[PDB]
Amino acid sequence: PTPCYISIEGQTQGLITAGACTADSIGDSFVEGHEDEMLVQQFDHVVTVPTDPQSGQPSGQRVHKPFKFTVALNKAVPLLYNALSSGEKLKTVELKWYRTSIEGKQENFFTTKLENASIVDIHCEMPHCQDPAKSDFTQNVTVSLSYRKITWDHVNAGTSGSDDWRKPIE
Template identity: 80%
Template sequence: MPTPCYISIQGETQGLITAGAMTVDSTGEIGLEGHEDEMLVQQFLHNVTVPTNPQSGSPSGKRVHKPFKFTVALNKAVPLLYNALSAGEKLSNVELKWYRTSSEGKQENFFTTSLEGAVIVDIECEMPHCLDPSNESFTQNLTVSLAYRKITWDHVSSGTSGADDWTQPIEA
């Protein structure tokens, strides 16, 4: 089973969109201490590519950042995410924190992905077929796709980082 990651989203108009998303009132289950203002990410997908010449392997175009997609269970932040999509609200800060079990047996944030200048470009809500017994452990899910201006990857534990702002030229 993958280790969890949590996402927090700050909108320029609505403020902290994920405020209270992991509380009992929001999830209907237990709240997660220390993660009350984040959403538990069920699935994540992101792809960055560089077009290349198939014969030589040489770059043939500018890098392409595909939508940053994450899936969460329905919670109190969902209506606010739809508001942000409908209004084209800029998201001033999106932060995805990845966790692992430390050598002391505790959860530690070892990797962080941050987005700047993000906007929601797609939301897909899905409920697995409720009469299919193989779906018993699933719930209603929301997949959110984000476009963004800048992305930063930080390996918190080792202190390494990388970033890409597609509005800036790449320097060697």
């Protein structure tokens, strides 16, 4: 799978990932043109709806389980440990799913934007240095995001979903 890109903008800390793919953040694995966007490796996201038994109807509104995106240690990680430990909301988070098209060029076929989105938890780990099976990995900083409003958006087919606590559907 191809890695995605996330651009986080905080309430008070401005654009958090501004510079999270320079040569100072991640060495020689930075990408030109994506200077304001982290490099997201793994992803996971659940949106449940409590339904009653012995029926099919939704017995309650949706419950957003958090984002789980994984980036390496870089410039934006000390900035994301103040959005976490102080409960600062983040004005936007624009994940962009890339894929390799037919003509041979990367393109975002799917973007999941995000409105006011605090960070629930951040799971910084490093695999065992003695272990040769996990030698290619560097670090794993899995930043979670609960969120008010999320907008899925498929670009190459124009569809767009949306959920919002602020404006539920009438």
